[PDB]
């Protein structure tokens, strides 16, 4: 019965609801907090954003090295800073 309103998604939420918010060419993980002020907390700290794509921590993908042509395995490590690595495999 306490709610939040998110102008980016245009939706109204209940305290405790979690949802994705597209903003600044990223996806954010948002939580409706409420706290007597319709507080929303949103974070990209559990994601990586690379190459026009949003990844979650733990995601892995493979792609050729753009110059070398050999295969890479990429991983979203996150670590509070969108840290990804791509390792030749």
């Amino acid at each position: 019965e306490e709610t939040c309103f998110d102008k980016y998604t245009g939706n109204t939420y209940r305290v405790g609801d979690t949802y994705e918010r597209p903003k600044d060419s990223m996806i954010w993980d948002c939580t409706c907090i409420g706290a007597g002020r319709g507080r929303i907390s949103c974070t990209i700290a559990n994601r990586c954003h690379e190459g026009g794509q949003s990844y979650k921590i733990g995601d892995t993908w493979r792609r050729p090295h753009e110059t070398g042509g050999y295969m890479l395995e990429c991983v979203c490590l996150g670590n509070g800073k969108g840290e990804w690595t791509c390792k030749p495999i």
Binding site: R37, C42, I44, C48, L72, N79, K81, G82, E83, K87
Partner: peptide, 18 residues
Amino acid sequence: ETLTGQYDKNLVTTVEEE
């Protein structure tokens, strides 16, 4: 080499709005 990237140092990762 292993390629690597991360968010800009000055990008805030967690924000609150009321």
